Amino acid sequence: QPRQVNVGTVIAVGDGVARLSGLDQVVASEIVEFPPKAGRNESIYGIALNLEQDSVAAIILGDDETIEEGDMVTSTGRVISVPVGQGLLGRVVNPLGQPIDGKGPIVYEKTRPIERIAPGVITRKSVDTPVQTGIIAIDALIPIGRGQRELIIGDRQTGKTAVAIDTILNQKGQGMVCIYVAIGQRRAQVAQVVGTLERFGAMEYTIVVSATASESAALQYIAPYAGCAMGEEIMENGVMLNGQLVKDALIVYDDLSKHAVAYRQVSLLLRRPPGREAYPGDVFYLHSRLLERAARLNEEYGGGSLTALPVIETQANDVSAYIPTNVISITDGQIYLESDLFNAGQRPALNVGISVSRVGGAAQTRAMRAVAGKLKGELAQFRDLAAFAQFASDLDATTKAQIERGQRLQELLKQPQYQPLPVEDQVAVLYAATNNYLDDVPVPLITKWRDDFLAFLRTAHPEVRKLIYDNRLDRKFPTPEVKEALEAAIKEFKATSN
Amino acid sequence: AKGVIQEIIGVVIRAKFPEDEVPEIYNAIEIPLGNGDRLVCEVQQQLGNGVVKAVAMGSTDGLRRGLEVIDTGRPIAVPVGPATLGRVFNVLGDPIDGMGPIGPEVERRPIHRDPPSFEEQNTQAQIFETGIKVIDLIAPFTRGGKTAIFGGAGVGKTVVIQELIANIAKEQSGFSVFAGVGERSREGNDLIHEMKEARIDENTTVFDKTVMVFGQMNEPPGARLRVGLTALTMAEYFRDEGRDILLFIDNIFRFVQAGSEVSSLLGRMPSQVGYQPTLGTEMGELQERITSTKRGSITSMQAVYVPADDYTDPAPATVFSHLDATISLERSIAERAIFPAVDPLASTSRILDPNIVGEEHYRVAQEVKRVLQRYKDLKDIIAILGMEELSDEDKLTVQRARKIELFFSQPFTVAQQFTGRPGKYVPVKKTVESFARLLNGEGDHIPESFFYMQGDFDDVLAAYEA
Amino acid sequence: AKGVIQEIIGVVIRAKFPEDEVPEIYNAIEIPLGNGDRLVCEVQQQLGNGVVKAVAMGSTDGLRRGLEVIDTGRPIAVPVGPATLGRVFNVLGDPIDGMGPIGPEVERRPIHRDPPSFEEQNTQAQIFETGIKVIDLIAPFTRGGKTAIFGGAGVGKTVVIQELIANIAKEQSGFSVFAGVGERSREGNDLIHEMKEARIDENTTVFDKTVMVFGQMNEPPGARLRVGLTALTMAEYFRDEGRDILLFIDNIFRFVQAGSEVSSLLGRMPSQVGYQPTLGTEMGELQERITSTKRGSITSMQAVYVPADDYTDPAPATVFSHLDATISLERSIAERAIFPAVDPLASTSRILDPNIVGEEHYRVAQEVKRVLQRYKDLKDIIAILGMEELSDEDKLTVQRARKIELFFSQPFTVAQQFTGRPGKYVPVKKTVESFARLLNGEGDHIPESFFYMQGDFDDVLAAYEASQ
Amino acid sequence: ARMVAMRNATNNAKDLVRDLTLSFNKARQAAITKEVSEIASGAA
C-alpha cells in the first residue's frame, strides 16, 4: 500500500533535539518517524515542537545517539497519541503506550491524542462522590472527592509515594481505575511500586506509565499527558472492571517537579528563553493543561470523573518555590507531609494545620462529614493549646483533659503502611474517639486499641460494620438504630480488653 | 488581507502579511481550521517586512507553516448588549453555555478601549451602598472603586458575591459581570453557575442578572490575559447606559501571571522576578476602565491570590497599587456560624475617613475595631488568668466585643431559601446608628445570640420585646 | 574519517568531517598529537555539514586549528573481564599502574550502554552489616541497593568511605570496583592502594579483587565526566556473570560538576546555578546502570559532595531520588567533634522495615529518631530560655537525646593517623542492644562525656566504672 | 532569680538575633545574585 510521506533531513542532532530541515506541511505536534536504517532495525519517534521558518526543531522520544546528520525523517500525519482502553489495565507502559513489562503486546483499538483541551466549562459537575483513601487523616480532615485534584506536597522522603500507593490500593471494590504515572523515577523504584501493587492484588485495575530517569527528557515531558489521556478515555468511555462499566479514574503523577525539570531540559535544549529559576515561561500553563483535564463530568456528558493526585518534593520544605507555588495554585487542595512530623512518630505525617481541601465536606460521606467536624475542631484547638502545653504546667483540669483529647486524636491517626481502613471502620473509630469512649485509654496503646477494636468488629460483630456502611449516605448518620449496637459494641469491647 | 503562517512556537504564531496590508498591533488573526471553526489569534508585535507576532488564544496543535490567516482589521470583537446577559462567554465572546450562539444583530465592540478621561472622573469619592453591615461599616466600597477579598474556600465568598449582585440589582438597576481569570474550572464553573442559578431574588435568579466570562487555567496565556478586557467591555456597555455595574474579576493575579507568560513567549526581556516589563501599564489599562464617571460607575470587587504569602511580590504589589478596599475573609469567623466571614480587623478601606463617610461613621468605626483592636487581647489573659475570675471593667469590653462580633452577621437574601431566614438589607445609616447605639450601652440589656442573625439594632430590640 | 579541527574552545573541540563520513553521536575521535601518543575525544553533538562537537578528555592545550582527527567509528571501548581485576585504569581503559597493557584478546566493551530494562530489575534487598553504629541503626547500608553519603567539605566523607571499605572489603564474597571521579590523588587514591594492598584475604589481597578506575581532580572535565561510565562498564561485566560487586564511586557530584563544565564549553543554555540543562538525564543515564539485576547484584556505595553546605543544590537534589539509603553528614555535627557526623534525622533507608531489618531494630531506630526529634523541636527554647523551662519528661528526653548524639560517635580504624582512639567495630545487634538499653533508662546516671568515642554500651559502662 | 534568668535570656536572644541577621544577609546576597544571574541569562 504505497503512500507519499513528507521527508526532511536531520541537519543537527544533539542532546535529544534534532533540527529536521524541510518538513513542510507538518502539524505542530506530529510524530516524526526516523525510519530504520543500517544499524538500527527499529524506529525512534520524535515530537516536532518548534516549527520555525526553514526548520523543525523536534525533541526525540528515545535514544538520540543512533540518529545521525543527514538521516531522513518521515512525518506521520498523526499528532502524538497514546493507545487507550481495557487492554492497558494491569500493564506497565512507557508514555508511548509500548509495554515495558514484557507481558505481551498491548491489545487496543483506540488511540487518544495526548495534550487535549480541558473537558469543558459547563460539562463538569459538583464533586460529591468521595475517594476513600483509607488514611484516617486524609479521609476525615482533608477529603478527596471524585473529580478533585489534590496535591501531595512534601520533602524528599516523607511518605508521598506511600500515601499515593495507599490510595491506589484502597480502591479495590470502589469502582475506581487507578493510573500511576512515574515521571523521572528510578526504574528500581517503579519496579518496587509495581511489586507492591501486584502483592496486594491492585494490578487488576492499575495502569503504570513510567518514564524513568534514564529515558530521554521528551518521554518524561509527555509522561503525564499520556496517562491523563488514559484517564480521559476511562471517564469518557469506561472500562469493564469486575463486570461493571467503571467510568472513574484516579491518576497519580509520581513527581510533577521532575516533569517540570524535564520540560526545562527540553526547552533549554531548544534554546527557548528561560524564565524564573531557568524554567520556561509557560510552565504554569504546562501544569494547568495537565491538571485541568481532571474533572467530574455531568450526567449529560457521561457522568464519569478523573481524580488527580500530583506529587511534589520541596527542597528544605520551601513551599514558596516556583513549581510548588504554581501547582499549589492549580490544585483544589494540598496534603503537606513534613519530615518533623514523620520523625516524631506521626507516620502519615500530614500537617493538618496547613493541609487544605477546598472541596470540603462535599467530598465526604454523610457519616464521615457528621463525625469528623468534632475531630477537626478538637485537633485545631489542640494545636492552638500546644503553646501552653510546651511551657505551662499550671493549666486547669479543663485544659489538661482538652490537650489529652487532642493527643488521643493525634495518636488515632498514626496509621501504619499498606493497611488501609474502609469507610465504616474509620467512622466507627472516629465515633468511639469523639464520644469520649476512648478517654480512659492511655495514649501509647491507642493505636493498638484501635487495631484490636477493629479485630473485634471483624470477629464479634460484622453486622454493625454492615449497618454502618449501608446507611452512611443518610442526612443524619447517628440513627438510633446505628447509635445502638455500636455504642453497645464499644462498651462490650471495653469490658473484654482491660 | 490574507497572510501565511511562518513560524509556530507554542502559543506564539508569526505570520507574514502582504506589504501594504499588515494588521494593526491588537487586531485578530482568525486562523481558519479544516473542521469549520477558526483559531482567533491576537497580534502583539508588528516587526520585519509585513510580519506580525501574535498570541494563539488556542492550542495550535494542528497548524502547519503555510496556513492562510485572515486579518479582521478590528481587535477582538465581543458581543455587548442586553442579549449578552445571563450567559457564559469565553475570551473571544463566543457563548460557551448550552444555549445558542449570539445573533448577528447584537452589537460587537472592540475588546481594547480607552479608559475615561481625567475630566470625567468624579472629584469626590463616594461610598457604595452594598447593604452588608460589616462591609458597609468596616471596609466601605467606592463608587467606581476596587476591593479585594483575601479568602480561600468554605468562607462564603461565593455567597457574598451572590448577595452583592442581588442587592445591586434590587436597590439599583445593578447588572453585574463576573470574569473568572485563571480559575479552577471546578470552582469557577458548575459551582458558581449552579449556585447562582439556584439562588433567587424577586423570582429572578442571580444568574439571570449576571454576565459571565471565563478564562480558566487550561486556556492559553492570551485567553487569561484578555478575559478581563472582555468583561470590562461587557460592563462598559451597560455603564454607557448610566446603569451601575458591579464587576468581579476573580483572581486578578492570574491576569498578571498570564501577561508574564505572554511576555516570556514573546521574547520580551524579563523584569524583576521573571515578570513582564510592561507590568504597571498592563495593569493600568485594565484597572483604569474601572472608575465612576458621570453617566455610570463600574464598581469592582476583585479576588487576589498572593503566591505563598508574599505581598512583596510584584504581582500583588501592582494589584494593591490599584485597590481601594480589602476584605479579609477568615476561617475562624466562618466556622463560628458567622455567615459573613469578614474579619472586623485586617479589612481596611481608604474611604473610612470623616471627610467622605462622615464624622459619625468614622467615629463609630473607630469605636468598634478598638474594643477589637486588642482583638480582645484579654483572650490571651483569660487563657492564663481565667479573667482573674473577672476584670475590673474589661469583662464589659469582652461582652460588647462578643455582641458586636455576633451582630456583624446578617441574613442574606440569596441564602434565604437555604437557611429559611429572610434576607435583611441594612443601609449604611442604619448600620452606623445601630452600632453607635450598641456601643453607648443600649445593647447591654439583651443577651448574646440575640444579635446572631438580625439586620438592625431595632430588629434586635423587636426580638427582645417579643 | 580524517577530519580537521576547526575550533578549540576549552576542552571542547569542533571538527569538520566529510559529508558522508560524519562520526556518530558518541563515537570516539583521535588527534594524532604527534610523539606517538594521541588525544581521544568523544563526540557530543552534530552541528551540520560534517561539523561535530566533541570533548577532549585531555590537556587539549597544545594543539592547533587544522589538526587532523581520525574517526575510530566506535565509542570508547574499555577492557572487561578478569584481566581488569587488580589493575588501575584511566577513563579510556588504559592502565596507569606499572604492569603491562591489557592484551588484545581481552574483550572491549563500549562505555555507553543501555541501563538494565524494567524486567531485569531486582527489588530484593537485605541489611548489610557495616560495623558503624549510626549507619547500621538509622540508615542501614543496603546489600544489592543504592546508598550514598551527602557531606560538605569539612566533614569526613573520605574517612567514612575508607572505614566502610576496610570493614566490608575482606569478606566481599565477590569482586569490587572503585571509581575515583574528581577526588584527591593523595588520600582518595594511592593510600587506598596502600590499605587495599595491605589487607589480605587468605593469601589474596583485597586489591587482587578490585578494579579501580580513577580520573581524579587533576584531570580535565571529560575524564571526570566519563570515568564513572568506564567504571560502570567494568563492573557490569562481573554483575552479568553472577559475581557480586561492591561498587564505590567517589563524589558523584564531581561527575555532575564536570558535566556542567563540559556543557558550559559546549554552548548549551545554562540552567539553575550554571548547571547543564541535561542534568537529570545525565544522572539517570549514569545511575540506572548502577542496579542489581536478576543475573547479579551490585552493592553500591556512593559519595556526594554538596557545594558550600547547600543540600538544595541541583546535583545532590538529583542524586537523592536515585538511592535506597541516604546518609547526610552535617558540618554542625562535625564541628562538635562528632566525626561520624551523620545526622540521624536527615538519614533514611528503604530497608529500615520491620520485615527486613527486624522488629526490635525497627522499633529502636524509630525511637532514636523520635528522640532527637523532640530535641530538634526544643533547640530554640534551650537556646534562649534554657534547660529549666522544659517539663520533667522533656528534660529527660533532651538529656537522652544529647547522650544519643554523643553515642553515635565512633572511632574508626582508619582514623588512627590524626586521632589516638583505637578503631571499634560494633555489630548491628550490639548497636541495637546498646541503644535499646540507653532508651530504657540504663545509663541515665552516666555523664554524657562518657558516650563520646565509644563502641557498644558495655564499653561506656566499663569507662564509667573506671572513672568510678 | 527571675531577673537573672531574664538577663541571660535577653543576652541569648541578642546573640540569636545577631546569628539570624548574618544568615538573613547571606540569604539576601544570594537572592540578589540569583535574580541578576537569571535576568542576565534571560537577556542573553
Ligand SMILES: Nc1ncnc2c1ncn2[C@@H]1O[C@H](COP(=O)(O)OP(=O)(O)OP(=O)(O)O)[C@@H](O)[C@H]1O
Ligand atoms: N506508615 C508510613 N506511612 C508512610 N511512609 C512510611 C510509613 N512507614 C514508613 N514510611 C517510610 O516511607 C517510605 C516509602 O517511600 P515514600 O513514600 O516516603 O517516598 P517518597 O516521598 O516518594 O520519596 P523519594 O523521593 O525518596 O522516592 C518507606 O521506605 C519508609 O521509609
Ligand SMILES: [Mg+2]
Ligand atoms: Mg515518590
